[PDB]
Symmetry: C4
Subunit: 80 residues, 4 copies
Amino acid sequence: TGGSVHSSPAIGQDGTIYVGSNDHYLYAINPNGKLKWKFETGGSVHSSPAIGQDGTIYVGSNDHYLYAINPNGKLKWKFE
Amino acid sequence: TGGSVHSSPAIGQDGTIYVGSNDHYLYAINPNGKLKWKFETGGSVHSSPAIGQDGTIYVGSNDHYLYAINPNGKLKWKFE
Amino acid sequence: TGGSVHSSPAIGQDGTIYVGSNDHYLYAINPNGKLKWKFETGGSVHSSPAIGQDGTIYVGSNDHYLYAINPNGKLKWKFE
Amino acid sequence: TGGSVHSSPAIGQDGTIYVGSNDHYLYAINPNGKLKWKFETGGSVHSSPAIGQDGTIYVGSNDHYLYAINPNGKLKWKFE
Ligand SMILES: [Zn+2]
Ligand SMILES: [Zn+2]
Ligand SMILES: [Zn+2]
Ligand SMILES: [Zn+2]
Ligand SMILES: [Zn+2]
Ligand SMILES: [Zn+2]
Ligand SMILES: [Zn+2]
Ligand SMILES: [Zn+2]
């Protein structure tokens, strides 16, 4: 990523690895190591992502938000 | 939330997302992004929640406590 | 506990909650909230415990060690 | 290890414990407590490892990288 990866990776059902970074982004990476997508938040993502039963990704941010992100990298919602 | 969300979200059997915040609270949020309940502790909740077999939520706090909280947001117990 | 509980609780097959504390200890607590045992390490336990298939508890410490602890609270081993 | 173990251990299907350390290394340890292998990264490993369906280990580092490491301790890839 573009900064320290303090957060811990989660794995989806098709093998995708999700992890947050200090550069403010949540990363989605393919098992072959090429970027799937990146989602841009307002602060460092120290917390670790969780995957719901439909494949929604949830992760917290230093900008005071819990994000919900669809498997395709579009925002679902963010609770402040 | 009202501060940095350093802690990592847990997911219940009915889809509820649980996460602690720096504003001292444990949050319970519905998959549609509306607040279910919030439980108020004495310090920042950096640690990540765990869900037991009956659905009790456990999480630690900076106020020296491990909290046990019923699925409805009432305190079960807190060990100091 | 006796200090900030930064670490995140793990749950055993019989419901026991395990969490580390800043007071240097790994705690084992019963679902009713009474202390089962406490194991004493050389520094703050920020990391979160894992449970193996036989029920061994593993957790790291600030004293440079990964601890392995039997379900009864006796040390199995510690790798430095 | 050679420094604080802030990160939280993951367990493989054959019982191996994986944990990162502050001495910059990801450790693979056998249930009997003897070192299996150690993988050397460019900074402190605060984040916690995840295990994929083929047994690949993923963990982040302070050197800005997410590492993918084969079960035998050779690098698979690292995304920067
Ligand atoms: Zn850096
Ligand atoms: Zn920043
Ligand atoms: Zn803030
Ligand atoms: Zn405060
Ligand atoms: Zn204190
Ligand atoms: Zn101390
Ligand atoms: Zn040290
Ligand atoms: Zn260093």
